[PDB]
Amino acid sequence: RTERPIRVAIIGYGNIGQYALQAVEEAPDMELAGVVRRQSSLEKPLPRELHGVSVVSDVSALGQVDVAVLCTPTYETPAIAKELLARGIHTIDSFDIHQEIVQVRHELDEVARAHQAVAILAAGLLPGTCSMIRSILEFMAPYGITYTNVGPGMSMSASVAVKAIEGVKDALALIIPIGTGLHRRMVYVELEEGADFATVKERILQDPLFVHDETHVLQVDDVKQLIDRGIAVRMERKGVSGQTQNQLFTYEMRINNPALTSQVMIASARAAMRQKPGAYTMIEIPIIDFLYGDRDELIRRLV
Numbered sequence: 041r042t043e044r045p046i047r048v049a050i051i052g053y054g055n056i057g058q059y060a061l062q063a064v065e066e067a068p069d070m071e072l073a074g075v076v077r078r079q080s081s082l083e084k085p086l087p088r089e090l091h092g093v094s095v096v097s098d099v100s101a102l103g104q105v106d107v108a109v110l111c112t113p114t115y116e117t118p119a120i121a122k123e124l125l126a127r128g129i130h131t132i133d134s135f136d137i138h139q140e141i142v143q144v145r146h147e148l149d150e151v152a153r154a155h156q157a158v159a160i161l162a163a164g165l166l167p168g169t170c171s172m173i174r175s176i177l178e179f180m181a182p183y184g185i186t187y188t189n190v191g192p193g194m195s196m197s198a199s200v201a202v203k204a205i206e207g208v209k210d211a212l213a214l215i216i217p218i219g220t221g222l223h224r225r226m227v228y229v230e231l232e233e234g235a236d237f238a239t240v241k242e243r244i245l246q247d248p249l250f251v252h253d254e255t256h257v258l259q260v261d262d263v264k265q266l267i268d269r270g271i272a273v274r275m276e277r278k279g280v281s282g283q284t285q286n287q288l289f290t291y292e293m294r295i296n297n298p299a300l301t302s303q304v305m306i307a308s309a310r311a312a313m314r315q316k317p318g319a320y321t322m323i324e325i326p327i328i329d330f331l332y333g334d335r336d337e338l339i340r341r342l343v
């Protein structure tokens with residue numbers, strides 16, 4: 041629909057990558073350049089939805105690539121981003137280690153500026169659009185407290201951490217809100233042949249991830265039967281606007297986690313094409329840059 045469509049490559053074909061495929065297809069200003077996978081994954085049978093899709097091991101085999109959408113594991117992502125920025129390719133990621141965002145942002149900023157590229161990081165569900173809402177609440181009521189309650193949903197960094205433990209064949213870890221920003225964790229574990237529940241319970245409950253947090257552990261026959269990739273996020277702020285107390289704000293979403301996250305990353309890919317070289321979180325970009333359409337028509341429709 042646009043003259044020269046944006047050519048988007050998907051790096052890593054996991055949960056995020058599969059939904060990102062659909063988001064790129066629906067994007068009227070974008071066309072799929074291809075999917076980049078590990079060589080090991082290239083040797084498994086080709087997924088049925090990737091028929092007619094260029095699936096390679098390096099971005100150089102896909103021709104021109106405007107933006108790379110990084111659907112890779114968290115710890116693997118900054119290094120992959122730096123590599124692609126250095127090739128002059130824009131990068132979108134949903135890096136979700138909050139304490140490392142400032143540092144990672146600086147490192148990507150320097151590489152991006154050196155190669156006339158734009159990196160948008162932490163552009164997912166949380167961090168991402170929830171961060172944008174959170175920041176808007178902040179300046180509407182500067183004094184007060186915001187509570188971010190991550191509703192019942194799967195934590196895939198906690199699930200694989202419970203899987204690496206001695207005695208667990210498979211595991212599902214859930215993040216559960218208990219109010220005022222506090223969270224409870226519940227772990228469903230499929231045990232190995234002949235391991236006892238009582239000990240493996242005490243190795244998860246004393247694992248560094250679940251010692252200072254309230255944690256419940258249950259043994260189940262099939263953890264795969266319990267998996268659903270939906271999640272909820274509820275944010276509350278009670279604050280002061282100017283000098284007037286008791287301003288009340290509530291934001292809630294009930295969404296498919298990877299579907300939404302991939303959509304935000306695709307919308308951010310659109311925004312990346314409109315920025316000066318550098319690295320940005322989502323609160324550093326005009327909201328209109330994430331939207332497709334004529335500027336005046338968007339203002340007429342939304343403002």
Ligand SMILES: NC(=O)c1ccc[n+]([C@@H]2O[C@H](COP(=O)([O-])OP(=O)(O)OC[C@H]3O[C@@H](n4cnc5c(N)ncnc54)[C@H](OP(=O)(O)O)[C@@H]3O)[C@@H](O)[C@H]2O)c1
Nearest residue numbers: 052053054055056077078081112113114134164165166167
């Ligand atoms: N910001 C948010 O609100 C939020 C929410 C959800 C997810 N995320 C982020 O999104 C990331 C991906 O989540 P997911 O559910 O899609 O995970 P996933 O299903 O495990 O997908 C990981 C994919 O990355 C590739 N990969 C795995 N190991 C790799 C390695 N060592 N080196 C290079 N590539 C590797 C693999 O694809 P191939 O087989 O094709 O190589 C794999 O399919 C997470 O790490 C998380 O940080 C953020």
